Amino acid sequence: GSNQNNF
Ligand SMILES: [Zn+2]
């Protein structure tokens, strides 16, 4: 799957 990190 895909992964996104929004700090
Ligand atoms: Zn993955």
The answer for residues whose C-beta is within 8 angstroms of residue 3's C-beta and 6 or more apart is none
- Give the other-Cβ count within 10 Å of 1's Cβ: 2
- Residue 5 CA to ligand 1 center (angstroms) comes to 13
What secondary structure letter does DSSP report for 4? -
- Residue 6 CA to ligand 1 center (angstroms) comes to 17
- CA–CA distance, 7 with 5 (Å, rounded to integer): 6
Q: What is the resolution of this structure in A?
A: 1.0
Method by which this entry was solved: electron diffraction
Q: Which two tokens stand for residue 5?
A: 């990190």
Q: Which two tokens stand for residue 4?
A: 């996104």
What secondary structure letter does DSSP report for 6? -
- CA–CA distance, 4 with 7 (Å, rounded to integer): 10
- Residue 4 CA to ligand 1 center (angstroms) comes to 11
Alpha carbon of residue 7 to chain centroid: 10
- CA–CA distance, 2 with 4 (Å, rounded to integer): 7
What secondary structure letter does DSSP report for 5? -
